[PDB]
Every structure is written in structure tokens, then in C-alpha cells.
């Protein structure tokens, strides 16, 4: 019956569409008509979203689910583990999870510090005003994925717009990574891609995984760096707390993840009848889920609509949950824990360079949410 509430409020860039809260607080699982007319369900409560995301009976194949944000489904491509179901998905997870632990990703902390440092240096040389996305929020996570995969230093510039060029397609990236995989097979190094050349993945699977990673590790991270910097610079009291207690970086990253919920909406399809929140979701029905509503659920978080880095903690669903929990979440944490405090240590008076209403927001249906540019000065 209901449609998905998607309209953001004009003075409130960080908060969810107003209609979600009253829906969630009344019926955290409810019937929903999708943009294409499919009648499925909408999960907005934190517990019900977790139950959807943890249950392997829920498919993420694009030829099984209906998309909740557009009125529009093909089988998954090699390497696109987010849209592959068990048991193939389980093969990717068993191979990759142990390579993506915090203990392994913390070994890239120095790389993250130096990537961050280099982009801060180029910002100061240019001077304000400038676009934080072009100078910092997009190149930092791009160079981080390049470091993770061991992309040659002299090739990395092909993967992001020049800081002041052809934007690579998926096919362009597959061609590049086919060559790089062959090179690492012949001459291994201490990096993830070299390590994976000894696995059972086919060339097509490994090349697809790399091309996916260059988007999966970049788009959301970039928009988190932009939105999180904007939110922090409006809260000088929280910046003071982070300056005085730099150990608060870890909590601040979790609280920003919860508050921003940039991967705001998704869906899954039932592979068989599933009891969910007192209802039977029948085989073939899609359940849309709202990460952003779940991350503001008062059933789960005190004062959910207040941003307070001092109480930041794991438990939010900003990296997903369960079957397809974000593989890169520990790397994302390492890079954001470096980046947010470093930006304000170098530019303590960082602030917007335009009226807040002039910041160009992404359209309400785009995922991830974020901004197209973030003009800043200092
Ligand atoms: C702050 C930055 C990031 C956010 C907000 C984010 C968010 C997410 C979310 C919400 C999902 C699950 C989507 C769903 O359930 O439909 C996911 C999956 C995934 N992410 Fe991330 N991610 C980020 C960074 C990264 C990075 C840095 C990498 C790689 C280096 C990465 C790789 C992946 C992969 C491979 C999956 C699929 C995992 C699976 O299917 O088992 N992510 N991410």
C-alpha cells in the first residue's frame, strides 16, 4: 500500500526523509508498492532490517529482487559478490574475510596517513576555496584501494579525476586488471591482489572483483568523508572533544556512519517463504530495507537524531549486516579514522566556502547519498 518516503527536508541535509520515522515507529515491517508496481514489503526498524540482512533465505540477485528506488534484472557478473547468493557467495566470503580483518587492514594505516598527508599538502598549496571532493574525499579512498590491491604507483592516476582524463568504464577496468593480474602472477608482491593470484578464483572472477572494488571502496567512502567533514565543522564543540581526546576518532567514525547512512536503502527477495516480524513474506516477494531509518530507530539508539561522537559505537547498519556485511568495512574505518582528525588538525578553521543551501546534494534516489561538490575554505 504505502510507497517508500524519499523526500529529504530542505534545511536538514543529514537527516532521513521525514515520513520514515512515523512509519517505522508504527509498523517496522509494512506492505509497500515498489516503483515498478511490485507489491512487496518495507523494513524500517533496526531489528527487522537486521533479520533481513542476516538471513540467507533472502537473495540479493538482481534477477530476483525488485529495486526500491527506480521504476525498472540480470544475473550477477563474475566477481560481484554483493549480488551473488550462497553457495557461490560463501566461497568468496571464506576466501576473502580473513584477508580483510582489522589486524590486516591496520597494516595499511601508514599508507592511509601518507595518502591523506599528500592530499592535505596539495590543498594548502592551492589555497581556499576549493572542492573537498576533487581534492580529498574522492582521491583518498581511490588511492587506498590502489594500495590495497598493489596497483603500480604510476598507474593510479587513471582511476580518479585530476586534482586541478577519461573516466574508466567497468570494461576499461577489467582490461587493466587482466594485465595487472598477469604481472602479479609473474612477480608477486606483499599485497591483496598478488595473494589472490594463488586462489581458486578464475581470471574473470578476480578481474571482476578488482573492478568492483574500485567503485565499492570509493563511492560510499568519498561521500562519508564529504558529509562527515561538513557535519563536524558545524559542531565545533565536537571538534574540540576530538582535538582534546584524539582517541575519540574511532567512536566519531562509527557515529558518523550511523548518522549519515549513505547506503540508505536496498532490497532482497525471499527465496522461500520466510516468517519476518510476525508476517509471512512469500517466496518471490521483495523486502525493501531502510538502513537510514534503522540507524535512527529509538528502539535501538538513545536520542537517535542527535549526532554525538562521544557515544559513537558499533551496532549501526551503515556497513550492512549479516550475509553481505561490507567486506571493506575495516579498511574504511582505518582510512576514516586517519582522515577526519587530520583534516581538522591541518585546517582547524575549515568551513564551507558557500551558503549551505548552495551545496549541490545528490538527488533523493541516488545511492549512496552525498554531495556532488563541497566547496570549503580555511
Ligand atoms: C564508508 C565506506 C563504506 C560504506 C558506507 C560501505 C557500505 C557497504 C554496505 C551497506 C554494504 C552492504 C549492502 C547491502 O547489504 O545491500 C557493503 C558491501 C560491500 N562493500 Fe562496502 N562500504 C564502504 C567501504 C568499502 C570499502 C573500502 C570496500 C573495499 C575495499 C568495500 C567493499 C564491499 C564489498 C566487497 C561488499 C559486498 C560484501 C558481500 O557481498 O559479502 N566497501 N558496503
Numbering used by the authors: 8 to 79, 82 to 173, 188 to 401
Article, verbatim:
The I helix, BC loop, the loop following the K helix, the second β strand of β 1 sheet and C-terminal residues together constructs a large substrate binding cavity by comparison of substrate-free and substrate-bound structures. The conformation of substrate-bound StvP2 structure showed no significant changes relative to the substrate-free StvP2 structure.
